[PDB]
Symmetry: D2
Subunit: 125 residues, 4 copies
């Protein structure tokens, strides 16, 4: 009893083996997330009692926004080290443009990407 | 006026060029969807008036379900040609298991994958 | 002294971070191989004295050949578990077709994929 | 007569459909190359007389070298538009560093990536 069918696709990830039509109970397969996506949780799913266990999630990278940076009077700190796309968990460092200073209540100039979202610092003249 | 920043990531797809920090108005880039995903719409985005145009969508493949097929008394027709994963737009063909016949109001035995969803035929004894 | 430039592409693999134009000595990045490719060695490269260390290799999966199997009078053992593509290190199990037996000096019916190569068993009438 | 087995893997590319164990004569499948790789030739292979036709090639992107650029006294022209990786067919534009000029017999400052190779311009003091 308890065989499973082919393992479920997940967004932005792939299993590391060729899918089969049927799997014995206790069988397992593993996922990997695509390059700039961070795999959250356990990469392995196991077949038990007719069902696969819960696959991991592939957490989204963050893209910097020209519009937001212009609006907030900030720029990337490191011109030769531009993290245009950042992994979830990775930090991006900004600076105030010439003639501006960190606003009160602003997030720090260094900020961390989480699943697509960057909380940008804000500078004022 | 009207330059754009780095192009947006999309689920299950990738741009075909290396991202740049800034793009001139009229610049374009192109997406491709990952292998079993079907690109819906125009693959190209263009920068105009400070904004990228709308990226395409990557339509999901369909995975056959052992549980559903067992419940509906069906199996794949072609044992040597098993579309365990099907592309959006692609058809999958089932048969009634021995001793069963297509129920009334059942979908045809041939059915088409659309963005992850297969409408399965149902057989009754 | 000793900064590095952008990390080298490798066949069938990708780095897990966004490439930068320059890296400080002691910086590191990591590779992942594409889904059915097996990463051989250490996934991490480190920048020292102006040079990246040696990247890993992505070992090739194996595809079964209809022509070879027909010529050798063999078939896959498990009709519902067809490893049409196998990872390096993974085993594939064949059987002699009806009316044939393992030849003398033949490889065992179970055989392991290594970097694209399967050593097929041979059956004789 | 003339059925084919599963289609061949190619470096840095993937087929766009789920592989099957057997294909009828006249069947076809299609490849796509991974994002910064340029597909050379016809993306489609067709099964005839027991054999697949010849798959396309995925032409390699080019990575700029810090060491070579330093040795040749050049830098990227566009600081905000750095093609750290370039597609085959795509051009990269350099400039002489301050205090240098294009050497005689040097390649032009604009140069095209071909299957991994850039022919770099050289500047002299």
């Amino acid at each position: 009893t308890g065989k499973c069918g082919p393992p479920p696709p997940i967004d932005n990830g792939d299993i590391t083996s060729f899918p089969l039509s049927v799997y014995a109970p206790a069988s397992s397969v593993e996922y990997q997330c695509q390059n700039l996506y961070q795999l959250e949780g356990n990469k392995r799913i196991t077949c038990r009692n007719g069902q696969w266990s819960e696959p991991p999630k592939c957490l989204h990278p963050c893209v910097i926004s020209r519009e937001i940076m212009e609006n907030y009077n900030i720029a990337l700190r490191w011109t030769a080290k531009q993290k245009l796309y950042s992994r979830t968990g990775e930090s991006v460092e900004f600076v105030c443009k010439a003639g501006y200073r960190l606003s009160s209540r602003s997030h720090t100039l260094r900020t961390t990407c989480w699943d697509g979202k960057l909380e940008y610092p804000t500078c004022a003249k």
